[PDB]
């Protein structure tokens, strides 16, 4: 069948923004297969061979100072321009999380069980989840899936709590996120 | 910190090209090479911004030429097939008979060529399903999402069959509800 070698070429123009358009850094990187070969860093002002394979291109492009000028200016004409274009629906995007608490398994009480705090469909990805037992924060026995990207500009995450639930116990999951004025709390009574 | 990435790639001999913009790991839009038009990830995006898709093709042209120059300079050193990690999950906790979406998450792979089909009870599904193009990674591997809207039931099992040159055989990632 089709058994030919494959040859991949990638080009990435990376605009890095710190404190908005206050501090900007342009990274133009060329990757052959799995190997970055040549790179432009606006902090440096010129191309640098990341590997020997990309040295011809670095020398070749650096020899043209007018191209270097345009590249340095790109921080404004390109990076800062695009930031402003999409800022409204990207940097300012905020989607409130849906928070649900439920026992992992159906267990009679007084037996080990995981308390699952489901936090799904939120944006952006910055988030803080906290477990409480009867008003007291519990930092031990917390297993997390970490931040999960859905691919549709939403994130989800599961923060689980190792517990042996007693009748009368109150468990609270507190969620903090840029999309809410105050912490979201959800209770589960054993 | 925020990061906007203009990501392009070209693959030989497949002759596959891609042009997309990325924001903090999410796709803003990509250019459909065949139709020569901008496709926004979220359609709302197209109401606040525009892109001359035609320019993306000029770039891909240069990329293709550069690839062949590079291919030769490397004495025809081919890419190593790195098989993907595959994960199936729902975009929300499952409630029997309550609308949901299965997410086939394909990750950490290269080259950006893959074959994905959903199987319900051993049979392909096409109705309602959608996918994303290949998302770029900092290690220069790729990321990809496949979706399948569905009503959870105790009577159905699902599989996300993934084909990639890095695999010795098709990879099935099972998902089913358990009472």
């Amino acid at each position: 069948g089709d058994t030919r070698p494959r040859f991949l070429w990638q080009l990435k123009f990376e605009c890095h923004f710190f404190n908005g358009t206050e501090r900007v850094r342009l990274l133009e990187r060329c990757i052959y297969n799995q190997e970055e070969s040549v790179r432009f860093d606006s902090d440096v002002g010129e191309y640098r061979a990341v590997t020997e394979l990309g040295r011809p291109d670095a020398e070749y492009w650096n020899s043209q100072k007018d191209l270097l000028e345009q590249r340095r200016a790109a921080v404004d004409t390109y990076c800062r321009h695009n930031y402003g274009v999409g800022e409204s629906f990207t940097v300012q995007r905020r989607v409130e999380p849906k928070v649900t608490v439920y026992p992992s398994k159906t267990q009679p009480l007084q037996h080990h069980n995981l308390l699952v705090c489901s936090v799904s469909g939120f944006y952006p990805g910055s988030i803080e989840v906290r477990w409480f037992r009867n008003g007291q924060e519990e930092k031990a026995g917390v297993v997390s899936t970490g931040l999960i990207q859905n691919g549709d500009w939403t994130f989800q995450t599961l923060v689980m709590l190792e517990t042996v639930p007693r009748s009368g116990e109150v468990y609270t999951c507190q969620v903090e996120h840029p999309s809410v004025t105050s912490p979201l709390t959800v209770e589960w009574r054993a | 910190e925020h990061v906007i990435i203009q990501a392009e790639f070209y693959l030989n001999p497949d002759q596959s090209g891609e042009f997309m913009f990325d924001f903090d790991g999410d796709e803003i839009f990509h250019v459909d090479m065949a139709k020569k038009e901008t496709v926004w990830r979220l359609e709302e995006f197209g109401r606040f911004a525009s892109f001359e898709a035609q320019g993306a093709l000029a770039n891909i042209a240069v990329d293709k030429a550069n690839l062949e120059i590079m291919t030769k300079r490397s004495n025809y050193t081919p890419i190593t097939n790195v098989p993907p990690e595959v994960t199936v999950l729902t975009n929300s906790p499952v409630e029997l008979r309550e609308p949901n979406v299965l997410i086939c998450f394909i990750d950490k792979f290269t080259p950006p060529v893959v074959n994905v089909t959903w199987l319900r009870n051993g049979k392909p599904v096409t109705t309602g399903v959608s996918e994303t193009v290949f998302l770029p990674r900092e290690d220069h591997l790729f990321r990809k999402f496949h979706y399948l809207p569905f009503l959870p039931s105790t009577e159905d099992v699902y599989d996300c069959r993934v084909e990639h040159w890095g695999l010795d055989e098709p990879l099935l990632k099972h998902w089913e509800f358990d009472a």
Partner: peptide
């Protein structure tokens, strides 16, 4: 405002 600008790839030699 208000269209996305793209950076252009430089061409190699030979």
């Amino acid at each position: 405002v208000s269209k996305m600008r793209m950076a252009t790839p430089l061409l190699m030699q030979a």
